[PDB]
Amino acid sequence: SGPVPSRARVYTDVNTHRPREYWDYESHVVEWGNQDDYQLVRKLGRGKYSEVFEAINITNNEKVVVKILKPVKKKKIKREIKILENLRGGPNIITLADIVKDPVSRTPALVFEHVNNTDFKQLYQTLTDYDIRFYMYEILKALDYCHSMGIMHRDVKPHNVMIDHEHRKLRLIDWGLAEFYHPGQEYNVRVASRYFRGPELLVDYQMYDYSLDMWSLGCMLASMIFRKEPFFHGHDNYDQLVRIAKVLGTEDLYDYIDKYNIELDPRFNDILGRHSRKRWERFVHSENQHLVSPEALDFLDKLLRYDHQSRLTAREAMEHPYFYTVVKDQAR
Ligand SMILES: [Cl-]
């Protein structure tokens, strides 16, 4: 008798009800643009999976961002393309503008809309309490959309949230690790940064769903309101769960493991130990108290649950009192 199966609480069957081609990305045929339309201007950064450049589309003098892909299986490229195309036009989702291939090297490049990003290592030091609520709400719009479209981002973290603070514009980017949710499908648990991995990934529970993104969002929120980046700073996959357990407690952890009949890696037995569930007040100090409020802590608590089924959905999260003033302002 192995682990208890799990199904997404919401948006469970959205992909089943769509045509096969919506989610069957291995069959996707890429529509290629003209690489000569783009002249690279300057290098913007290096990623795990790509080199990122600023470019100009010389056919319309539009500034774009070009991610030249490092070698990866074509099906992973098809997946990212299919997901980006499925989500195009969705709220706060980065827009894929073109897909080109260098005719000599055969290296593919994804061409995106440009976003005048403010560096989060300089932005987060200036964000107000209202700013955090505002941008969290904007992230939730993107997550509710992609979840409703049958897609888990699986790499929610500050580096994948581009913010043009001057225009109060937000884009959730870097969909190369996202996947389609299918009920009963088992997924890879080692895909994104450990600091934002939900406990289900850390205990190798593979039948997870959209709620993994909600854990990651909670980790982001904690780091923003407490000014501690990353919040759960584990040394490895095992230590990561210890860091969580020292805050959320081991009792809720073992209850979760028992409920889903999860076989815990023998390493965890020694290192997890016994820990009380702590109060969030212990992370509040004079440098971050202007960002911490009862509503922030209530919201954070409802995201950071071991049991993925008990975390707020993106839509429930948007109804939380933490966002009341944001919702009122956006309505006028
Ligand atoms: Cl959701």
Numbering used by the authors: 2 to 333
Provide excerpts from the study.
The serine/threonine kinase CK2, a member of the CMGC branch within the superfamily of eukaryotic protein kinases (EPKs), is a heterotetrametric holoenzyme consisting of a central dimer of non-catalytic subunits (CK2β) to which two separate catalytic subunits (CK2α or CK2α’ encoded in Homo sapiens by the genes CSNK2A1 or CSNK2A2, respectively) are attached. Unlike many other EPKs—in particular its closest relatives within the CMGC family—, CK2 it is constitutively active in the sense that it does not require a phosphorylation or any other posttranslational modification for activation; alternatively, salt- and polycation-dependent self-interactions of CK2α2β2 holoenzyme complexes were proposed as a regulatory mechanism and experimental evidence of such interactions in the cell was provided. CK2 is involved in important cellular processes such as pro-survival signaling, cell proliferation and DNA-damage repair. From these substrates as well as from peptide studies, the consensus sequence S/T-D/E-X-D/E for CK2 substrate recognition was derived.
A frequent OCNDS mutation is the exchange of Lys198 to Arg at the center of CK2α′s P+1 loop, a key element of substrate recognition. In CK2α, Lys198 plus two further basic residues (Arg191 and Arg195) impart a positively charged character to the P+1 loop fitting to the enzyme’s preference for a negatively charged side chain one position downstream from the phosphorylated substrate residue. The structure of CK2αLys198Arg was solved by molecular replacement and refined to a resolution of 1.77 Å. The asymmetric unit of the tetragonal CK2αLys198Arg crystal contains two protein molecules. While their C-terminal segments were not visible in the electron density, both CK2αLys198Arg chains were largely well defined from residue 2 to 333 and in particular in the region of the P+1 loop, which contains the mutated position 198. During structure refinement, a number of large and approximately tetrahedrally formed pieces of electron density emerged at positively charged surface areas of the enzyme molecules known to be relevant for substrate recognition. We filled them with sulfate ions because of the relatively high sulfate content in the crystallization solution (200 mM) and the absence of alternative anionic candidates. In the context of this study, two sulfate ions located at the “central substrate-recognition region” are particularly relevant because their binding sites are the P+1 loop, which harbors the critical Lys198Arg mutation, and the activation loop. At these two cavities, sulfate ions have been found several times before; in a recent high-resolution structure of a CK2α1–335/heparin complex, one of them—the P+1 loop site—even harbors a sulfo moiety of a heparin disulfo-glucosamine residue.
